[model samples]
Target: QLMAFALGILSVFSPAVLPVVPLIFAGSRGRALDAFLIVAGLTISMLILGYTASLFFGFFRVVAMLFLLIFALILLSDELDEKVSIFASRMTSGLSWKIQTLPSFFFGMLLAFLWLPAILPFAGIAISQTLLSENPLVMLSYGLGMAVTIAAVFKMGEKFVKANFQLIRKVTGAIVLLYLAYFALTEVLLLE
Candidate 1:
């Protein structure tokens, strides 16, 4: 249990250091308080977030399926796919910049679900404290650990290599493409 708790705390840094954190922070473009609030909005919901993982994860998987389908269609033609992506970008363009704080909050909320799937075994146990035990501090401690790294990343946004994050995104996109293809083929064969 002791080692599990320690591992749980350490696991917070996995998503914290991911490109998304710094990107969120940089996007806020305000005082540290802005970054803090965004991080808080994202991390502070751990108890509720953990409890509803199934619903959130289900939605994400569906969204991933749509994305993979779009990627496949994109492969068929240049002009159509580029236009489709442009439309997607416009549709998902996020906060019109008139309401500045809301974008950060929404982005933070969106990130929370995206962030949850990487749960490690010990961390998974630690998070289960919400469901299994009366003590809430286990989740709190893990969230605080994550928040600190996220805040620091926001603080040091200029120091990070943007290319590194972009590369990771690109690789992930390719992997999703391949996974969707394999799944589709498997389904087709199984049906016949």
Candidate 2:
């Protein structure tokens, strides 16, 4: 259980999630309090999400690659001419106005609950190996450990980015590209 807890924290520091730390901080206008608040909100939200799914024994779900793929493509293609996203588009149009029109805060929470749905099935299969282990403390420890690491990174980077934002945007864009490539690689390869 402790080992799994460690792995969860490690995953956040992996090629996947670590890049998002500073990018998020950079957007906070370099206000330490604001950056910390957003990270705290994000961390608590993620904890609740994981705990909720674990409580239910898991959400029999897909990786959502096709929809994620469409979203990613739209981001790169015709990004200039687009203001609202496909999410906002189908939102106001034909796709799912009923749900999308709900309070934006509700939508924010729902979206926050599942950032990488495209790769969740793969993560699910990995985490599922122990999801039913009945160690509630493990989930708590995992969430707490993740929260610790997230806060440390946010605090560290908020200061660093304040000193070197011009250089940092290059790094930020590179990380975004890497994340995008991971989705393309995972979805196209159908890794799950």
Task: Give all TM-scores, in the order shown.
Answer: 0.22, 0.24
TM-score, prediction 1: 0.22
lDDT of 2 by residue, 1-192 (tens): 213333333333333233343332233223333322322222222223332346632222223222333434533454353222323342222223353475533443333223322121222223553544343443343443333334434444324322333333232222222222323322222112
lDDT (C-alpha, whole model) for all candidates: 0.33, 0.31
Best by lDDT: 1
- The residue-by-residue lDDT of candidate 1 on 78-142, one tens digit each, is 44434234423422332133445453334423421232122223233444455553544444545
Candidate 2 wrongly placed segments (more than 4 Å): 1-31, 51-166, 170-192
Q: How much is 49 displaced in model 2, in angstroms? A: 1.8
Clashes of each: 0, 0
What is the Cα-based lDDT of residue 146 in candidate 2? Answer: 37
